[PDB]
Scaffold this motif. Structure first.
Motif, short mmCIF file in Angstrom:
data_model
loop_
_atom_site.label_atom_id
_atom_site.label_comp_id
_atom_site.label_asym_id
_atom_site.label_seq_id
_atom_site.Cartn_x
_atom_site.Cartn_y
_atom_site.Cartn_z
N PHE C 155 0.83 -1.20 0.00
CA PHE C 155 0.00 0.00 0.00
C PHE C 155 0.87 1.25 0.00
O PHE C 155 1.81 1.36 0.79
CB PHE C 155 -0.93 0.00 1.21
CG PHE C 155 -1.86 1.17 1.27
CD1 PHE C 155 -2.99 1.22 0.47
CD2 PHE C 155 -1.61 2.23 2.13
CE1 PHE C 155 -3.85 2.30 0.52
CE2 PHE C 155 -2.47 3.32 2.18
CZ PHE C 155 -3.58 3.35 1.38
N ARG C 240 -2.17 8.62 11.33
CA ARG C 240 -3.05 7.48 11.53
C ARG C 240 -2.94 6.51 10.35
O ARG C 240 -3.04 5.30 10.52
CB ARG C 240 -4.50 7.93 11.71
CG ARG C 240 -4.81 8.51 13.08
CD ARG C 240 -6.31 8.66 13.28
NE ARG C 240 -6.88 9.66 12.39
CZ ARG C 240 -8.18 9.90 12.27
NH1 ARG C 240 -9.05 9.21 12.99
NH2 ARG C 240 -8.62 10.83 11.43
N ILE C 241 -2.72 7.06 9.16
CA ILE C 241 -2.58 6.25 7.96
C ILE C 241 -1.27 5.45 7.97
O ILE C 241 -1.19 4.37 7.39
CB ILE C 241 -2.65 7.10 6.68
CG1 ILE C 241 -4.06 7.69 6.52
CG2 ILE C 241 -2.28 6.28 5.46
CD1 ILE C 241 -4.23 8.56 5.29
N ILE C 244 -1.86 2.11 9.46
CA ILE C 244 -2.45 1.21 8.48
C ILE C 244 -1.40 0.70 7.50
O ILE C 244 -1.38 -0.48 7.14
CB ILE C 244 -3.57 1.91 7.68
CG1 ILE C 244 -4.68 2.37 8.62
CG2 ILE C 244 -4.12 0.99 6.61
CD1 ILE C 244 -5.71 3.26 7.96
N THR C 248 0.09 -3.30 7.11
CA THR C 248 -0.02 -3.99 5.83
C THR C 248 1.35 -4.43 5.33
O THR C 248 1.51 -5.55 4.85
CB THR C 248 -0.68 -3.08 4.77
OG1 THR C 248 -2.05 -2.85 5.12
CG2 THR C 248 -0.62 -3.74 3.40
#
Lengths: 264, 264, 268
Positions: C155, C240-241, C244, C248
């Motif tokens: 990602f 915050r991303i 994530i 991943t």
């Protein structure tokens, strides 16, 4: 209300506001007061009468739509250091454009009929409406940035409704004037017609629109809880505008002086 | 009974074929169809979560010569004429739960794919817009022509704003026009357009591509959830607006709806 | 509290408040190595502080490259090492440092600076995101940009956040997931880049943007204030991303890791 020529058609609930009936063709304090005054009055009557999906058209009796903010006033207040009076003017202008944006509190369909040039505040006023009808040629833009004056009537907020935040930012800073056709391709205007056909185009929009009154009102309710530009937001932006305006140096002020003269 | 479901747990692909019960009536979102869809969504979503399957695929298709004609007009007329707001609202809320489920991947971060091989009107078009990928075959027409009898569109606006500007979305919603797959593609409202009879093959292509990046997909969905995703609560407030407007449909609109049902 | 800021070649023009940052002055592969990231963030802070103290209005900062490519993105070699070692802490630290760097350009170093990305070579992954973080993107013909890393299930930072400033949320997602490379011309028509010029004309194009932009300093500052209270990407959101992203990344399989191994060697 001497600055406005009002034509009201109660039967079909269509109302016409013609700017500059007194005549530079700009948003003078008198014009702004007259507009907000009428907006409030009309909105009250519409609400009291319980009219559904009325139409309000913003037009001009001059050879231009509107040249924007009262630069002569700006220069006076800035040189005098009267932030309070300048802020008040800005807030009144914002109330005016926001009223068109939200349909005068009567879920009205606001239509901007631009048959002449719309600069600065003038272009902003058009962008505040729900539908923009322009004739050829016409010229629209925010060239005031070229003497370092930040647009002060919701240009960014209204543009973002139609285009990307990034593109809106580019347009605002560039200071270019765009033709009606260019604006159509950019999605900043809705319909472009030949000279003298503006009113006819407006009538077409009204006739087509009047066939879906409840659908329009419903759409407006949805905009109110979703994408509508908050008045509170615009007011916070006026604070930024006034602070920047008050910092304009004599170079900018003198340029504004010359512009007023050339236009007047 | 309204659905023909084909489950492929082998590759975690799940096909939902609407209108299995007609194989005789109107291919719309009947109360039964909505219940069947929402029931399966909830069941599948829970199964997927428990199994912890990563990036499953759910396909919304139709066994009829049309994709879906939208809201149950026959039902609307009955409830409206009876003044049963409660039942109408309940129906609307169930529809919103269905489309929102596709929008958020059934709560299992699944990839929703709309396979439109026939006309998608009103709710049908909105159903497609609720998915993550829209695959249409040439010739197919989509739109929200119901506004023409003054029936506001559900989640149309919410979903459209994900793809286009708020202004354009509003104009499309109120114009009542039908658009071909080709046009929709250029507008950014559909993702892929293929020849008649190649729709399924196109879906399989999307699946293959996507399955090669399950973790990246899951991550993207996580990001959507904390940024641009349409809030269910937001859509549920819009249902209030929708029902209030629907309940005000006049006799002429009802007769028009009656005729449309008959014709279709 | 000033401190020392050789991965960069810096050219400062305080006479006109223009500052040039050239990546890869040390040149392995032209990517965002821990060294490069630290050099960039260190300079951003230093320059930003100077600009704030000076009270300069509408300074210009240019992000460029001394390599035949703009930037190849994240340090894949590092990713493979950390992922295989299960070192989430160090991987997360890297991501957060990258975020601080790109966000700084997005908000003009905290000095309302005009960030300009001069892309004269390929910009992949983090490289493309870095450009998207700036206020203006100038690219030369032939240049390719994209996020192909998604192809091995990695990602893409703030790519999504930055694209949504220019295009629809839906289109941003598709671009983010497809893994395709786009030419400068294509990107222009998409609104992802601002100007495309012939090879070797990038600098001239940057000068043009600057010269014209310098006529509206107060207007620029005001616009930035408006952005801050409206559409600007919050550092909090990007952080915050990163959570994530790292979660991943740590799940990358052997196939992906091996693909990354070979890519590094091929590019190096």
């Amino acid at each position: 209300g001497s600055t406005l020529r009002i034509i009201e058609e109660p039967q079909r609930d269509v109302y016409w506001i013609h700017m500059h009936a007194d005549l530079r063709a700009c948003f003078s304090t008198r014009l702004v007061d007259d507009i907000t005054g009428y907006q409030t009055n009309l909105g009250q009557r519409l609400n009291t009468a319980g009219v559904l999906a009325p139409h309000v058209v913003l037009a001009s009796d001059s050879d231009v739509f509107n040249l924007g903010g009262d630069l002569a006033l700006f220069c006076q207040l800035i040189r005098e250091g009267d932030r309070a009076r300048l802020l008040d003017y800005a807030q009144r202008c914002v109330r005016g454009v926001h009223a068109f944006h939200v349909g005068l509190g009567a879920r009205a369909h606001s239509i901007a009929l631009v048959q002449g040039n719309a600069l600065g505040g003038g272009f902003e006023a058009a962008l505040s409406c729900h539908t923009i009808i322009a004739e050829e040629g016409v010229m629209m833009g925010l060239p005031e940035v070229l003497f370092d004056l930040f647009p002060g009537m919701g240009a960014y907020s209204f543009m973002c409704q139609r285009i990307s935040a990034h593109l809106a930012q580019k347009i605002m800073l560039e200071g270019n004037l765009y033709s009606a056709e260019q604006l159509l391709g950019m999605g900043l205007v809705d319909r472009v017609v030949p000279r003298g056909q503006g009113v006819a185009a407006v009538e077409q929009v009204i006739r087509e629109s009047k066939r879906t009154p409840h659908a329009w009102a419903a759409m407006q309710q949805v905009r109110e809880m979703t994408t509508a530009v908050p008045l509170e937001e615009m007011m916070r932006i006026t604070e930024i505008w006034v602070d920047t305006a008050m910092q304009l140096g004599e170079k900018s002020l003198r340029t504004m002086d010359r512009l007023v003269r050339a236009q007047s």
